[PDB]
Amino acid sequence: EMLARKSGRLLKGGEPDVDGVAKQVLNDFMRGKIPWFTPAPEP
Amino acid sequence: GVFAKRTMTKTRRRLRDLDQIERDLRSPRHLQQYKETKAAEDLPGLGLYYCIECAKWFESETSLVGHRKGKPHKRRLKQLKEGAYTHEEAMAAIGYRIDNG
RNA sequence: GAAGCCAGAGGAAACUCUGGUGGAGGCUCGCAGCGGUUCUGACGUGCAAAUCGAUCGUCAAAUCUGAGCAUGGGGGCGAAA
RNA sequence: GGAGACGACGGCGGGGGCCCCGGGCAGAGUUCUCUUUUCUUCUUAACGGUCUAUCACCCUGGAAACAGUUUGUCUGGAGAU
RNA sequence: AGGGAAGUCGGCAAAAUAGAUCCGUAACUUCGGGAAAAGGAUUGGCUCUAAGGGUUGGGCACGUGCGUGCGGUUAACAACCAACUUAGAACUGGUACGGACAGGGGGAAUCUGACUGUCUAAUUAAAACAUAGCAUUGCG
RNA sequence: GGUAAACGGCGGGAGUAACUAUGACUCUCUGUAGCCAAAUGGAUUAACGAGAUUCCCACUGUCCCUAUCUACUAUCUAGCGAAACCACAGCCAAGGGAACGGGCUUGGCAAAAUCAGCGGGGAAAGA
RNA sequence: GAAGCAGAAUUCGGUAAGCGUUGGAUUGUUCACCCACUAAUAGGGAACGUGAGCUGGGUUUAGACCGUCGUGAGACAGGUUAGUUUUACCCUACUGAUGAACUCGUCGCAAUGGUAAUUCAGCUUAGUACGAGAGGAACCGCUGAUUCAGAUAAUUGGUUUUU
RNA sequence: CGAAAGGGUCCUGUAAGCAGUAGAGUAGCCUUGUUGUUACGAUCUGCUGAGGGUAAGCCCUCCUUCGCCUAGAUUUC
Ligand SMILES: [Zn+2]
């Protein structure tokens, strides 16, 4: 909701578009726009 | 300017009635039930800026203040000053009454 | 709403900020014009051997257009199909 | 030596014609009520005369406490006002 | 009507949006843009109020409507003339107020060609062609 | 002899006895956000597009499930008036070796002359 | 009809085609499988033993890229995009509508052709039969509903050139 | 029977015109404000469920008017 109100992803009446914002966040996670990795097991 | 004027009279586009708005102005409990039937997270401005007379939510306090200067708000005020049509006035129009003993 | 220009406020100066002014662009919405995207479109011995309607592209320029003149088939011309 | 003789675009200023407004004479229409009303004519050629009209140029003089000045910042001791 | 893409290969078609004033406007970016992004508040009629202009016009002392020598910048005043915008307020009708007409639906992304432009007149308008930029070769 | 080293070929690194091209013969190869670079480390490229694709909100006669209204036709009349196509013709069923019947065989049957429609054959695609 | 088939729910088999057999999701794909509702979501033929109704995939004229092959024109293991067939007034069939002859008309008969209903639920039976328990029927009787069919417009919605 | 008309029944929504100590306000004349007054002024109120329409596929009307009528032509055991 905070991301939607910040980026202006509003439905009618200013209701935040959590569906579209979640899709955007998932695409950013998948396409190397948010940093993440699996740490290797320790020997 | 009315949005989608063709289907304004559909039941799924119905707005709140003037007698209900009068009851909201008179009793805060009835307004509380009406606001309970809504979800605050989906409301404009998180439901903080509300005009009871127009039964309307606004995105900001400046938006609400600017709406109060418009003629729809003044039309609602004039309608409320004249009074809402009710079942009791409908009874009095035909000269009927309720006998409870 | 580009350069140029005026004023005010700072800054040692260079410059920085604010309000104006100005009127640039193979910029943009869009009328004519030019073009020709779409539609189980009209028409299908048609009004027409390519027309009609709605819709659409472009619209100050690599824009549109007349007349005069030049290039002629082993050729010409071709932002090339 | 000059004229013939020359691009595109932008805003600004002058002039003609058109459009618009007021009065007046004459005519027409409206008129249950209202409307001193609504409408029509009221023009002036080429060619000449005369008096004038931005730019620019000339004379005096010598400008800082710089000045003049366009919507648009150009002009001036190479002489401004 | 009620439902709202359940239709269909596919929202094809239609519907929805639309003028103007005001609030407000993200990621990304070649910093120029994106952008009318998005999302909101309003608009009729009447009766008023306010603001924004033009033209003309100064007292003495001499010579006689002009020449000097002065003197003063409250003309900050009078007279006359003129037009269209902008802002503010009350009242009032309402099912509608850009009342017909005219008039963006918007958003998240992917592929693709840099862009403006051009061609298969009469089935293909495009990742095709051209383009600026870049690189090579030949020639005194 | 030198290469645009273009096409092309091309697992490396040491050696030597060859001694120059071709060598040949052994050996053996596996930071939950850093460092270094002239802020950035990019093509995961902005803008633009009647280019191709997926989804969301709004929206609705796309359906569900159809109904109704208007104009112009179709229809009827007066006048006017073609063309395509055409061996002959046009109800079917079973059989008719060459996997074909409309005509033959055997049956069902079968009654003048007509109008609006219709799209199963038959005709109909500059087929 | 048979089965440890108590009841309930079934399983296997027989006669039977009278009557039904449905939405929907998914095109990185042999589109076949998932989900639900339901009494049930049975299977086929009349095309596919070539073949003009409408419209998507095999699918393929001419424009264009990308991959593979080729010196090349070009071809293909391939992948992508955009792309012209456009009757009916004829005969038959079918659906309806007239009709000569028998004077006109009224009331009838009925050969022959067609033929129509379907399934579920609830109340009662009954918490009964049956059962250790958990559970748990049916016939007669009654009332609704699904699908189909034939009508109708009092009411309610829709439609408005009643311009 | 037809054309009108009247009544009913429906549809809309309160006609034209006049008036009003209703009307935000503005400008004049004077008693300079004491509905001061007059003028204009969306709108409001009254006359007024009024006006308008009503079969074209609505109803009634010997007893509300006006008109029409025993044809013409063709054919038939
Ligand atoms: Zn309000």
DSSP summary: helix tally of chain B: 5
Fraction of residues in β-strands of chain B = 5-15%
Strand content of chain A: under 5%
What's the SSE pattern of chain A? HH
Head-to-tail CA distance between termini of chain A: 42 Å
Number of helices of chain A: 2
Q: Estimate the global geometry of chain B from the Cα principal axes.
A: globular
Query: What is the rounded Rg of chain A?
Result: 15 Å
N- and C-termini, Cα separation of chain B:
52 Å
**How many strands, what sense, and barrel or not for the largest sheet of chain A?**
none
| Strand order of the biggest β-sheet of chain B | 1-2
Helix content of chain A: 40-55%
Number of strands of chain A: 0
Query: Structural class of the secondary elements of chain A?
Result: mainly alpha
What kind of assembly state do the chains in view correspond to? part of a larger assembly
Radius of gyration of chain B (CA) equals 16 Å
Question: Which class best fits the helix and strand makeup of chain B?
Answer: mainly alpha
Question: Helical percent range of chain B?
Answer: 40-55%
Question: How would you sum up the major sheet of chain B?
Answer: 2 strands, antiparallel
Structural description of this entry:
Chain B: GO terms for molecular function: nucleic acid binding; ribonucleoprotein complex binding; zinc ion binding. Chain B: Belongs to the ZNF593/BUD20 C2H2-type zinc-finger protein family. Chain B: Its main location: cytoplasm. Chain B: It is found in: Cytoplasm; Nucleus. Chain B: This is Zinc finger domain-containing protein. The structure is cut from a larger assembly and holds chains A (43 residues) and B (101 residues). Chain A has 2 helices and no strands. With 43 residues, chain A is an all-alpha fold. Chain A is rod-shaped, with a radius of gyration of 15 Å. The N and C termini of chain A lie far apart (42 Å). In chain A, 5% of the residues are buried. With 101 residues, chain B is mainly α. Chain B contains 5 helices and 2 strands, in the order H-H-E-E-H-H-H. Chain B has helices at residues 18-26, 28-36, 61-68, 71-82, 87-94, and strands at residues 49-51, 56-58. Chain B has a two-stranded antiparallel ribbon. In chain B, strand 1 and strand 2 form a beta hairpin. Chain B is globular, with a radius of gyration of 16 Å. Chains A and B meet through loops of A and loops of B. Zinc ion (ZN) binds next to helix 4 of chain B.
